[PDB]
Protein backbone atom coordinates (compact mmCIF):
# COMPACT_ATOMS: atom_id res chain seq x y z
CA UNK A 1 0.00 0.00 0.00
CA UNK A 2 3.06 2.19 0.49
CA UNK A 3 4.28 4.25 -2.46
CA UNK A 4 6.93 6.52 -0.91
CA UNK A 5 9.97 4.92 0.71
CA UNK A 6 12.95 6.32 2.55
CA UNK A 7 15.98 5.16 0.59
CA UNK A 8 19.25 6.42 -0.84
CA UNK A 9 18.34 9.11 -3.36
CA UNK A 10 14.78 9.88 -2.30
CA UNK A 11 14.01 13.59 -2.43
CA UNK A 12 12.45 14.85 0.80
CA UNK A 13 10.78 18.19 1.47
CA UNK A 14 11.56 19.77 4.83
CA UNK A 15 8.45 21.07 6.61
CA UNK A 16 9.86 22.63 9.79
CA UNK A 17 13.17 23.42 11.42
CA UNK A 18 15.96 25.78 10.38
CA UNK A 19 15.90 24.28 6.87
CA UNK A 20 12.13 24.47 6.45
CA UNK A 21 10.70 24.81 2.96
CA UNK A 22 13.69 23.36 1.11
CA UNK A 23 14.17 20.15 -0.82
CA UNK A 24 16.91 17.71 0.15
CA UNK A 25 18.20 14.29 -0.86
CA UNK A 26 18.46 11.35 1.51
CA UNK A 27 22.08 10.20 1.46
CA UNK A 28 22.22 7.70 4.33
CA UNK A 29 20.09 6.27 7.13
CA UNK A 30 20.80 6.00 10.87
CA UNK A 31 18.91 4.54 13.85
CA UNK A 32 15.35 4.71 12.43
CA UNK A 33 15.15 8.35 13.46
CA UNK A 34 17.76 10.27 11.50
CA UNK A 35 19.17 10.44 8.02
CA UNK A 36 22.38 11.83 6.61
CA UNK A 37 20.79 14.41 4.32
CA UNK A 38 22.50 16.70 1.82
CA UNK A 39 20.77 19.00 -0.65
CA UNK A 40 23.45 20.85 -2.59
CA UNK A 41 21.45 22.71 -5.22
CA UNK A 42 18.78 23.73 -2.69
CA UNK A 43 21.17 25.33 -0.16
CA UNK A 44 21.28 22.65 2.53
CA UNK A 45 24.74 21.45 3.41
CA UNK A 46 25.25 17.86 4.50
CA UNK A 47 23.99 17.10 7.99
CA UNK A 48 21.87 14.69 9.99
CA UNK A 49 18.15 15.30 9.97
CA UNK A 50 15.20 13.67 11.76
CA UNK A 51 12.57 11.82 9.76
CA UNK A 52 9.80 13.78 11.46
CA UNK A 53 10.56 16.98 9.53
CA UNK A 54 10.77 15.15 6.19
CA UNK A 55 7.92 14.76 3.72
CA UNK A 56 8.97 12.43 0.94
CA UNK A 57 8.27 13.49 -2.63
CA UNK A 58 7.90 11.26 -5.67
CA UNK A 59 11.42 11.86 -7.00
CA UNK A 60 14.22 9.33 -6.55
CA UNK A 61 17.81 10.13 -7.49
CA UNK A 62 20.42 7.55 -8.46
CA UNK A 63 23.73 7.63 -6.61
CA UNK A 64 25.64 5.28 -4.30
CA UNK A 65 25.08 5.57 -0.58
CA UNK A 66 27.28 8.12 1.22
CA UNK A 67 28.65 9.42 -2.06
CA UNK A 68 30.17 12.86 -1.99
CA UNK A 69 28.31 16.11 -2.56
CA UNK A 70 29.99 16.37 -5.96
CA UNK A 71 28.13 13.30 -7.22
CA UNK A 72 24.94 14.28 -5.39
CA UNK A 73 24.97 17.64 -7.17
CA UNK A 74 25.79 15.97 -10.48
CA UNK A 75 22.78 13.67 -10.22
CA UNK A 76 20.53 16.50 -9.01
CA UNK A 77 21.46 18.80 -11.87
CA UNK A 78 21.10 16.05 -14.46
CA UNK A 79 17.64 15.33 -13.06
CA UNK A 80 16.70 19.04 -12.98
CA UNK A 81 14.84 18.49 -9.72
CA UNK A 82 14.27 22.23 -9.33
CA UNK A 83 12.16 22.52 -12.48
CA UNK A 84 10.32 19.25 -11.90
CA UNK A 85 9.47 20.23 -8.34
CA UNK A 86 8.30 23.61 -9.57
CA UNK A 87 6.11 21.77 -12.07
CA UNK A 88 4.46 19.56 -9.45
CA UNK A 89 1.19 20.56 -7.82
CA UNK A 90 2.70 20.37 -4.32
CA UNK A 91 5.06 23.28 -4.92
CA UNK A 92 2.31 25.14 -6.77
CA UNK A 93 0.11 24.87 -3.67
CA UNK A 94 2.95 26.06 -1.44
CA UNK A 95 3.64 29.02 -3.73
CA UNK A 96 -0.05 29.94 -3.78
CA UNK A 97 -0.23 29.78 0.02
CA UNK A 98 2.80 32.06 0.29
CA UNK A 99 1.46 34.60 -2.18
CA UNK A 100 -1.92 34.49 -0.47
CA UNK A 101 -0.29 35.30 2.86
CA UNK A 102 1.80 38.14 1.44
CA UNK A 103 -1.31 39.88 0.06
CA UNK A 104 -1.76 43.55 0.90
CA UNK A 105 -5.00 45.36 1.73
CA UNK A 106 -5.39 46.75 -1.80
CA UNK A 107 -4.86 43.28 -3.24
CA UNK A 108 -7.48 41.97 -0.81
CA UNK A 109 -9.87 44.63 -2.11
CA UNK A 110 -9.24 43.62 -5.72
CA UNK A 111 -9.63 39.95 -4.81
CA UNK A 112 -12.94 40.73 -3.12
CA UNK A 113 -14.28 42.53 -6.18
CA UNK A 114 -13.10 39.91 -8.67
CA UNK A 115 -14.46 37.07 -6.54
CA UNK A 116 -17.79 38.86 -6.08
CA UNK A 117 -18.33 39.24 -9.82
CA UNK A 118 -17.02 35.75 -10.61
CA UNK A 119 -19.34 34.11 -8.11
CA UNK A 120 -22.26 36.11 -9.50
CA UNK A 121 -21.55 34.78 -13.00
CA UNK A 122 -21.02 31.20 -11.85
CA UNK A 123 -24.14 31.16 -9.67
CA UNK A 124 -26.24 32.49 -12.53
CA UNK A 125 -24.87 29.76 -14.78
CA UNK A 126 -25.68 27.16 -12.11
CA UNK A 127 -29.26 28.41 -12.01
CA UNK A 128 -29.45 28.06 -15.79
CA UNK A 129 -28.14 24.48 -15.61
CA UNK A 130 -30.63 23.62 -12.87
CA UNK A 131 -33.41 24.97 -15.08
CA UNK A 132 -32.21 22.85 -18.00
CA UNK A 133 -32.13 19.69 -15.87
CA UNK A 134 -35.43 20.63 -14.19
CA UNK A 135 -37.42 20.88 -17.42
CA UNK A 136 -37.69 17.07 -17.59
CA UNK A 137 -40.94 15.15 -17.00
CA UNK A 138 -41.11 11.53 -18.19
CA UNK A 139 -41.81 8.56 -15.85
Amino acid sequence: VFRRFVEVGRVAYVSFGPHAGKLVAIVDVIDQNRALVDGPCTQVRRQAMPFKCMQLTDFILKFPHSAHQKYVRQAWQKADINTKWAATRWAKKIEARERKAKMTDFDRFKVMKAKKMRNRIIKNEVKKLQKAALLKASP
Binding site: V1, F2, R4, F5, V6, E7, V8, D28, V29, I30, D31, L36, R46, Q47, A48, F51, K52, Q55, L56, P64, H65, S66
Partner: protein
Amino acid sequence: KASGTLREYKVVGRCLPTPKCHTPPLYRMRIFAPNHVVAKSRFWYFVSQLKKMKKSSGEIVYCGQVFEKSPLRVKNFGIWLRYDSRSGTHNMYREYRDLTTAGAVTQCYRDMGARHRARAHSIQIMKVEEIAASKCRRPAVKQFHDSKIKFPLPHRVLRRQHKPRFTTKRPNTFF
Protein backbone atom coordinates in the same frame (compact mmCIF):
# COMPACT_ATOMS: atom_id res chain seq x y z
CA LYS B 1 27.52 14.78 36.81
CA ALA B 2 24.59 15.87 34.65
CA SER B 3 24.49 15.99 30.86
CA GLY B 4 23.38 18.03 27.86
CA THR B 5 25.05 17.55 24.50
CA LEU B 6 28.35 16.05 25.58
CA ARG B 7 31.62 17.20 24.05
CA GLU B 8 34.80 15.16 24.10
CA TYR B 9 37.84 16.76 25.74
CA LYS B 10 41.46 15.67 25.66
CA VAL B 11 42.71 16.48 29.16
CA VAL B 12 46.45 16.33 29.76
CA GLY B 13 47.58 16.46 33.37
CA ARG B 14 50.53 15.70 35.57
CA CYS B 15 51.74 15.64 39.13
CA LEU B 16 53.30 18.77 40.54
CA PRO B 17 57.11 18.83 40.38
CA THR B 18 58.91 17.51 43.45
CA PRO B 19 62.59 17.33 44.38
CA LYS B 20 62.21 13.55 44.17
CA CYS B 21 61.11 13.81 40.52
CA HIS B 22 61.39 17.16 38.75
CA THR B 23 59.83 15.71 35.58
CA PRO B 24 56.68 13.84 36.56
CA PRO B 25 55.05 12.13 33.58
CA LEU B 26 52.18 13.58 31.59
CA TYR B 27 48.94 11.65 31.19
CA ARG B 28 46.16 12.03 28.65
CA MET B 29 42.50 11.20 29.14
CA ARG B 30 39.42 11.51 26.97
CA ILE B 31 36.57 12.94 29.04
CA PHE B 32 33.10 13.25 27.53
CA ALA B 33 31.76 16.19 29.51
CA PRO B 34 29.23 19.02 29.14
CA ASN B 35 31.98 21.64 29.49
CA HIS B 36 35.66 22.05 30.27
CA VAL B 37 35.02 22.58 34.00
CA VAL B 38 33.28 19.24 34.38
CA ALA B 39 35.94 17.78 32.10
CA LYS B 40 38.67 18.81 34.52
CA SER B 41 36.64 17.53 37.48
CA ARG B 42 36.09 14.13 35.89
CA PHE B 43 39.75 14.02 34.87
CA TRP B 44 40.87 14.49 38.45
CA TYR B 45 38.34 11.93 39.63
CA PHE B 46 39.65 9.36 37.15
CA VAL B 47 43.36 9.92 37.70
CA SER B 48 42.83 9.77 41.46
CA GLN B 49 41.84 6.14 40.98
CA LEU B 50 44.26 5.30 38.19
CA LYS B 51 47.37 6.83 39.77
CA LYS B 52 48.30 8.30 43.14
CA MET B 53 47.45 11.81 42.01
CA LYS B 54 45.32 14.58 43.46
CA LYS B 55 43.90 17.82 42.14
CA SER B 56 45.72 19.79 44.82
CA SER B 57 48.99 17.85 44.50
CA GLY B 58 48.98 17.96 40.70
CA GLU B 59 48.01 20.27 37.87
CA ILE B 60 46.26 20.14 34.51
CA VAL B 61 48.52 21.25 31.69
CA TYR B 62 45.91 21.03 28.93
CA CYS B 63 42.15 20.78 28.44
CA GLY B 64 41.02 20.96 24.82
CA GLN B 65 37.88 19.97 22.98
CA VAL B 66 38.46 17.21 20.44
CA PHE B 67 36.55 18.07 17.29
CA GLU B 68 35.05 15.21 15.32
CA LYS B 69 37.38 14.30 12.48
CA SER B 70 34.66 13.04 10.11
CA PRO B 71 31.33 14.59 11.17
CA LEU B 72 29.72 13.65 7.84
CA ARG B 73 30.55 9.93 7.77
CA VAL B 74 28.00 7.54 9.24
CA LYS B 75 29.94 5.13 11.40
CA ASN B 76 29.52 2.57 14.17
CA PHE B 77 30.72 3.13 17.72
CA GLY B 78 31.37 0.40 20.24
CA ILE B 79 31.45 1.62 23.82
CA TRP B 80 33.00 -0.38 26.61
CA LEU B 81 31.63 0.89 29.91
CA ARG B 82 31.14 -0.19 33.50
CA TYR B 83 28.45 1.01 35.86
CA ASP B 84 27.02 0.63 39.36
CA SER B 85 23.58 -0.95 39.22
CA ARG B 86 21.34 -1.06 42.27
CA SER B 87 22.79 -4.43 43.26
CA GLY B 88 26.39 -4.48 42.10
CA THR B 89 28.70 -3.38 39.31
CA HIS B 90 28.63 -4.65 35.75
CA ASN B 91 30.56 -4.20 32.51
CA MET B 92 28.64 -3.57 29.30
CA TYR B 93 29.47 -3.18 25.63
CA ARG B 94 27.07 -1.19 23.49
CA GLU B 95 26.64 -0.31 19.83
CA TYR B 96 25.60 3.04 18.37
CA ARG B 97 25.57 4.85 15.04
CA ASP B 98 26.36 8.55 14.99
CA LEU B 99 28.28 11.18 13.06
CA THR B 100 30.21 12.20 16.19
CA THR B 101 32.02 10.33 18.93
CA ALA B 102 30.58 12.72 21.50
CA GLY B 103 27.10 12.19 20.08
CA ALA B 104 27.56 8.43 20.40
CA VAL B 105 28.57 8.85 24.04
CA THR B 106 25.56 11.07 24.73
CA GLN B 107 23.35 8.42 23.13
CA CYS B 108 25.00 5.87 25.39
CA TYR B 109 24.22 7.87 28.52
CA ARG B 110 20.61 8.34 27.41
CA ASP B 111 20.23 4.67 26.51
CA MET B 112 21.71 3.49 29.80
CA GLY B 113 19.34 5.81 31.64
CA ALA B 114 16.32 4.56 29.71
CA ARG B 115 17.10 0.84 29.73
CA HIS B 116 18.84 0.34 33.08
CA ARG B 117 17.74 3.37 35.16
CA ALA B 118 21.42 4.27 35.54
CA ARG B 119 22.50 7.84 36.14
CA ALA B 120 25.42 9.63 34.56
CA HIS B 121 27.31 9.47 37.85
CA SER B 122 26.93 5.69 37.89
CA ILE B 123 28.05 5.31 34.28
CA GLN B 124 31.83 5.16 33.76
CA ILE B 125 32.99 5.20 30.14
CA MET B 126 36.23 3.31 29.63
CA LYS B 127 36.52 2.89 25.85
CA VAL B 128 34.89 4.40 22.76
CA GLU B 129 35.98 2.90 19.46
CA GLU B 130 34.96 3.38 15.86
CA ILE B 131 34.45 -0.16 14.57
CA ALA B 132 33.59 -1.74 11.25
CA ALA B 133 30.18 -2.88 10.10
CA SER B 134 31.52 -6.42 9.91
CA LYS B 135 32.76 -6.05 13.49
CA CYS B 136 29.32 -4.89 14.65
CA ARG B 137 27.56 -7.29 17.00
CA ARG B 138 24.23 -5.89 18.00
CA PRO B 139 21.42 -6.56 15.50
CA ALA B 140 19.79 -3.16 16.06
CA VAL B 141 22.87 -1.69 14.38
CA LYS B 142 23.63 -4.65 12.11
CA GLN B 143 20.30 -4.22 10.34
CA PHE B 144 21.34 -0.80 9.00
CA HIS B 145 24.33 -2.12 7.02
CA ASP B 146 22.62 -2.48 3.66
CA SER B 147 23.33 -0.53 0.49
CA LYS B 148 19.71 -1.04 -0.63
CA ILE B 149 18.07 -0.09 2.66
CA LYS B 150 14.48 0.97 2.09
CA PHE B 151 11.57 1.50 4.45
CA PRO B 152 8.45 3.68 4.65
CA LEU B 153 7.23 5.67 7.63
CA PRO B 154 3.86 4.00 8.16
CA HIS B 155 2.01 6.00 10.80
CA ARG B 156 2.81 9.72 10.69
CA VAL B 157 1.13 11.05 13.82
CA LEU B 158 0.21 14.71 13.38
CA ARG B 159 2.39 16.86 15.62
CA ARG B 160 0.51 20.12 14.96
CA GLN B 161 -2.41 18.88 17.03
CA HIS B 162 -3.16 22.32 18.49
CA LYS B 163 -2.83 24.29 15.23
CA PRO B 164 -5.70 24.39 14.45
CA ARG B 165 -7.15 23.18 17.74
CA PHE B 166 -10.66 22.83 16.30
CA THR B 167 -11.30 21.78 12.71
CA THR B 168 -13.95 20.06 10.63
CA LYS B 169 -11.58 17.60 8.92
CA ARG B 170 -10.34 14.40 10.53
CA PRO B 171 -6.58 14.04 10.03
CA ASN B 172 -5.15 11.63 7.49
CA THR B 173 -2.23 9.48 8.65
CA PHE B 174 -1.21 7.79 5.40
CA PHE B 175 1.37 9.87 3.56
